[PDB]
Design a protein around this ligand. Structure first.
Ligand code: NA
Ligand code: NA
Ligand code: NA
Ligand code: NA
Ligand code: NA
Lengths: 70, 281, 70, 70, 70, 70
C-alpha cells in the first residue's frame, strides 16, 4: 500500500542504525542502510517520496519507497 | 564591433569593460542594481567576434598600441590576437571559424585553452602575477611573436591578457582585483586560486544565475555567493544558456533557500551507505 | 540491448533491495547495489541514462546502464 | 535528550574513524560510519540537525541525529 | 602513463560490476569500487579527470585517476 | 597538528590504494576509504579542509581532517 506520499519533513538516523522519515505527518523507519542516503537526498532535494509497505501505521517499518522529482 | 580596453587608469579600465558589457549583453532582471548587473551575453551567431584594442599600457600614451585581441562574442574566448602594425591575426587552432577581414590570418597549431597555454607558457594561472609592467612585457612579446606556433613568452602574454580582458569582463571580481595593478602605486595583481576557480566555473555559473530569484545564497560547485552583493561583486557577464550544460537538464535545485547547481548537489548525494562503501573493497 | 534511453521518470527502492527506475515509460530493476545512489543522482539532475539489458520490456532487470551527458 | 540543535559548524573525520560535528557550540562524535556522508551533506546544505544522546556533554558521543530542512 | 585527461563524456556501470568512463574519446574501465561514486561526481560536475594506466588503448583498465578542478 | 588548510586543489586515487589530496600547496594521502567521498565532496563543493596529523610532513598519510563550508 502507499503508506505516505509527500516531502520528507525530517529524517533521523537512529541509535539502532535504522533511519526514520516523517512523510505527510507520519513517521516510518527503515533498517535498509542504503535507503539512508537515498532518503536524505530526497529530503534535501524536495523529492516527493511514496513510502510503500504491507502495513502503514505511523512508527512502522518500510523497505519500499518511490522517489519522484515531483 | 571594436572596443578599446584602456589600461591607463582604474577608471579608464573599468569604463572600458563596462562599455563592452553594455553593448554585448543584457542584464538579468533579478541580478541588477543600478547599471551594475550580472548580464547575459546577447545571442550572436557562432563566429561573431568583437575586437579589443589594447590601449593605455603606458598611461594615457599612444604607445604600445598595436595589439588587438579578437574575442568570440558568444563565449568571450580570445580567439587570437592581431598585430595591427603588421596587420596579422594569429588565430588559435580552435578558432578556425573566426574570420577577420582585412588582415593576414596566421592559423596557429596552438589551441586557445588554458591547459595548453599554461603548458606552453610554463606558467600556472594560480599565482600568476600581472602588473602594468608585465602587460607591457606581454605586449612586446606579442608584437615580437611571429609564427604559426605559440612560444612560451607569447603564451605567457596571452594568459595575462586573457585574464585582464575576457576574464575581467566575465568577473567583476577579477576586474576589481586586477585593476589595483593599474594604480599609480603599480602593485602586482596575483591571480588567486579563487579567481582561477571562477574562471573554471563560468559556464556552470552561467547556467545557474538566470534561475536566481533572491534566494539566500547560490552554490555552484566550489563557488558560493551568500547574497546579491557577493554575486554582483563577483560576476558581471555570463553565457547565454538559452558550456552551460555539463550533463542532465536541471539547472538548479533550491535547498534550504539556497539555489544549488543541481549537478553539485547530485555529486555529493550519490554516495551509498558509508559502511557498505568502505567495507566493499 | 539498449532498452531505454532518457531521463529517470521515477526510481524506487524495492523490498528485495533491488532498485527500479522508469525510463522512457518502462520500468527496469537492478540488483546492483551501487547503482542506487548513482541512479538517484542521475534522476535528480535529469541525466539521461541508457538502460541496457537482455530484455527491454517494462519489468526487465538490468545490470548495466550508461550515464550520458545528453 | 536533544543535546544540540542547529547547523553543523564544522565536521571532522577522526583518526579512529569516528566523526565529529560541532552544533550550537558543542562537539559530539559518532562512531557510526553511515552518519559521515549524511552529516557532511547536512553541513553542506545548511540542514538543522538535532544531536540526540543520553549524554549531552560537549565531547561526548551520539548515534541519533535528526535532519531538518529550513 | 597518463592515458587521457578530460571530462567524462559518459560513464557506464558494467555487467561485471566494473565501471567505465569515456575520457578524451577513449573508454577505460575500473574495478575499483571506491571510484564509482567519485567518477560519477566528476562527470556530474565536469571535473577534468586524468586516467593513468599502463596501457592507454580504449578498453584498458585503470586503477589510478586524478580529479582536477578545471 | 594542522598540516594544511584550504580548498582541495586536486584529489587522486592511486594504484597503491591511497587517496591523495593537495591542500595549500601540499600533498597528503589517506587510505581511509571513508574519506574518499568526504574529501571529494569537499573538493567539489569548495569546502575548506584542515588536514590534521601528528605527521605534517609532505606526502605523509593522514586520517584526521576537518571540513568547513567557509
Ligand atoms: Na510498515
Ligand atoms: Na565606458
Ligand atoms: Na546591453
Ligand atoms: Na544542471
Ligand atoms: Na553523548
Amino acid at each position: 500500500a502507499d503508506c505516505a506520499k509527500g516531502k520528507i519533513e525530517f529524517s533521523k538516523y537512529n541509535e539502532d542504525d535504522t533511519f526514520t522519515v516523517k512523510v505527510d505527518g507520519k513517521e516510518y523507519w527503515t533498517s535498509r542502510w542504503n535507503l539512508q542516503p537515498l532518503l536524505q537526498s530526497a529530503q534535501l532535494t524536495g523529492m516527493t517520496v511514496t513510502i510503500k509497505s504491507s502495513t502503514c501505521e505511523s512508527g512502522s517499518g518500510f523497505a519500499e519507497v518511490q522517489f519522484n522529482n515531483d | 564591433r571594436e572596443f578599446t580596453i584602456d589600461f591607463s587608469t582604474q577608471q579608464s579600465y573599468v569604463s572600458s569593460l563596462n562599455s563592452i558589457r553594455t553593448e554585448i549583453s543584457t542584464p538579468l532582471e533579478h541580478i541588477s542594481q543600478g547599471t551594475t548587473s550580472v548580464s547575459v551575453i546577447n545571442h550572436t551567431p557562432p563566429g561573431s567576434y568583437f575586437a579589443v584594442d589594447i590601449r593605455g599600457l603606458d598611461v594615457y600614451q599612444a604607445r604600445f598600441d598595436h595589439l588587438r585581441l579578437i574575442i568570440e562574442q558568444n563565449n568571450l574566448y580570445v580567439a587570437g590576437f592581431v598585430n595591427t602594425a603588421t596587420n596579422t591575426f594569429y588565430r588559435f587552432s580552435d578558432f578556425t571559424h573566426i574570420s577577420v577581414p582585412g588582415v593576414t590570418t596566421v592559423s596557429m597549431t596552438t589551441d586557445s585553452s588554458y591547459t595548453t597555454l599554461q603548458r606552453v607558457a610554463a606558467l600556472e594561472r594560480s599565482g600568476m602575477q600581472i602588473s602594468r609592467h608585465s602587460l607591457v612585457s606581454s605586449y612586446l612579446a606579442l608584437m615580437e611573436f611571429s609564427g604559426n606556433t605559440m612560444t612560451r613568452d607569447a603564451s605567457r602574454a596571452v594568459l595575462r591578457f586573457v585574464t585582464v580582458t575576457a576574464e575581467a569582463l566575465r568577473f567583476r571580481q577579477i576586474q576589481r582585483e586586477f585593476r589595483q595593478a593599474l594604480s599609480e602605486t603599480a602593485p602586482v595583481y596575483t591571480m588567486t586560486p579563487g579567481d582561477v576557480d571562477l574562471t573554471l566555473n563560468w559556464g556552470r555559473i552561467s547556467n545557474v544565475l538566470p534561475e536566481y530569484r533572491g534566494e539566500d545564497g547560490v552554490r555552484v560547485g566550489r563557488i558560493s555567493f551568500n547574497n546579491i552583493s557577493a554575486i554582483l561583486g563577483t560576476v558581471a557577464v555570463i553565457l547565454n544558456c538559452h558550456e552551460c550544460q555539463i550533463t542532465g537538464d536541471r539547472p538548479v535545485i533550491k535547498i534550504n533557500n539556497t539555489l544549488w547547481e543541481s549537478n553539485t548537489a547530485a555529486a555529493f548525494l550519490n554516495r551509498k551507505s558509508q559502511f557498505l562503501y568502505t567495507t566493499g573493497k
